[PDB]
Point group: C2
Chain length 208, copies 2
């Protein structure tokens, strides 16, 4: 008698198809609309009584934004609406940015076919869902977002002093090691962070 009205939005109709199959094997879900661009979605959301939107992260919007910004748009403008984000982007920084939006869950498209029905079941109990394929990928950028390889204490110290305005020769004195050592530790640290020059490095460090 009381079921979850769902809207589904994706760029590609074979995805829209695949989701519709998964969801008609669930009696308490009613799909009340499907859309292939963000403009038709946004423009029809006021006309449709929906509890939840399942949507692609990377859907093309000519009006209301793209990607993460489009998800912010929707949250802000339809605040009662629960959102599950469906994506194929398994970059940790991207998945993390998404989760800072306080949406009701994330599902990877190449993650298990069972994840989407779990997401909705969690949501049907007022709960948020996060699959393990996502959980473990967020382990990764455990290291403060450096990546897998953390800075060594010595490496961190060198960069700390550079950021404070010391030139390499001054750091060698301050730390009592050779200039060949210091340059090698800086280089090594810059390699771990993904920076190729000092201005990029100093930019990098000023938000960290």
């Amino acid at each position: 008698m009381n079921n979850m009205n769902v809207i589904i939005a994706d760029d590609h109709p074979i995805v829209l198809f695949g989701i519709r199959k998964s969801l008609e094997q669930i009696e308490w879900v009613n799909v009340v609309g499907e859309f292939e661009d963000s403009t038709a979605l946004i423009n029809n959301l006021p006309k449709l009584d929906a509890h939840v939107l399942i949507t692609d992260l990377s859907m093309p919007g000519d009006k209301y934004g793209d990607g993460i910004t489009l998800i912010k748009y929707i949250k802000r403008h339809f605040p009662s609406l629960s959102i599950i984000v469906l994506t194929m982007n398994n970059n940790p920084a991207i998945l993390s940015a998404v989760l800072d939006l306080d949406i009701e869950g994330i599902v990877l498209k190449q993650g298990a076919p069972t994840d989407l029905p779990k997401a909705l079941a969690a949501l049907q109990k007022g709960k948020k869902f996060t699959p393990e394929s996502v959980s473990r990928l967020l382990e990764k950028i455990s290291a403060g977002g450096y990546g897998d390889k953390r800075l060594s204490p010595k490496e961190s110290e060198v960069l700390r002093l550079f950021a404070e305005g010391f030139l390499v020769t001054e750091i060698a004195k301050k730390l009592n090691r050779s200039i060949k050592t210091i340059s090698s530790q800086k280089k090594s640290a810059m390699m771990k962070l993904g920076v190729e020059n000092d201005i990029a490095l100093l930019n990098y460090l000023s938000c960290v």
Copy 2:
């Protein structure tokens, strides 16, 4: 009858010497102390009536901080005290960070021998001094701190979409160009920013 009491602090005594020569050819300056480490400086500042401190950016502090942080310490703890920062670091990001401290001026050590007496003359009129050798170096990181080479509009767009969570193949579609083109523009843009991988890139962009 009424003259500028100056304190001077540097790691190296040949600098302390050179400054003392420059300043005794100015009758209205009285040097009231000189120091070779930040700890003796800070600990004696309460005992000395000084209007201005001339100090090295990269002075070693075992207690009160290093570099830019040491300059913040001094500002915060001796707020009536005017500070001229003397340095050999001609990195623009460093000089810029320094100028955000609202100090009374900057002088480069390898900049003209006339700059230090100009700095004090400006300060004697209640004015702030900035030599042109510094002014032009700050032109450089005109480009929003990218460096000399700005991103092309096309390059900026590609990075905008990456940051929004689009994969390269999705960007090619969205922008209606080839994947070979998009990858080439991303690569090229990453090269201009000084980033070697996607996580470094996404970190970079989130504060810019």
